[PDB]
Amino acid sequence: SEAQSRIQDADYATEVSNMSKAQIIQQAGNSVLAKANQVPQQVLSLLQ
Amino acid sequence: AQVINTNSLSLITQNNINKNQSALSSSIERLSSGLRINSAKDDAAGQAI
Amino acid sequence: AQVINTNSLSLITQNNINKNQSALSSSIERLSSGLRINSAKDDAAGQAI
Numbered sequence: 734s735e736a737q738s739r740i741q742d743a744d745y746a747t748e749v750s751n752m753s754k755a756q757i758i759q760q761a762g763n764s765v766l767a768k769a770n771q772v773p774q775q776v777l778s779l780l781q
Numbered sequence: 782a783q784v785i786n787t788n789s790l791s792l793i794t795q796n797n798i799n800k801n802q803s804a805l806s807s808s809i810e811r812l813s814s815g816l817r818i819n820s821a822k823d824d825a826a827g828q829a830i
Numbered sequence: 831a832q833v834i835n836t837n838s839l840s841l842i843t844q845n846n847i848n849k850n851q852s853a854l855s856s857s858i859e860r861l862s863s864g865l866r867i868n869s870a871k872d873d874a875a876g877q878a879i
Contacts, residue, residue, distance in 0.1 A: 738787035740827045740830055741817045741818045741827065741828075742816075742863070743812065743814070743815055743816070745812070748808055748811055749812065751804065752805065752809055752812055753828060755802075755804050755808055758801045758815065758863065759798060759801055759802070759805060761861055761862070761864075762796070762797055762801065762862045762863070764790065764800040765861045765862055766791060769788070769790050769791045769794055769858055770788075770791060773782055773785045773788060774782055774789065775782050775783075776782050776785055777792055779782075782847070783847070783848060783851075789855075790851075790854070790858060791853045791855065793855070793862065795858070797859070797862035797863035798862070801863065801864075806868065812856050824851075
């Protein structure tokens, strides 16, 4: 049983860190994506 | 700016977020579950052993 | 210098904006996915290492 545990176990210490990393990366991506949509807006100011 | 019809600077961000979503899902489901294999999507050698 | 066919100032400013857009997109991509390399096209040494 001790040997089988090594193959399949949650390893919470690394999993919570990976989840936090993924959440931070997702929030950063959403922020920079919302910031990215405003790039073609300057053409309107270019027109008039 | 110079182009309106295509905005690749947003497509790359969308692709990055999509790639991150896989790791997010895997981590969250492995956290909720007690196991690590999660239906043999990983290396099947571990599941068989 | 009263010509109208060629507006050199517009060309200069447009090429400046186009040159800056590359670094802009690079910055937003590096923010997007957690990597200074992110399949680097500037150097291969760091990628190989």
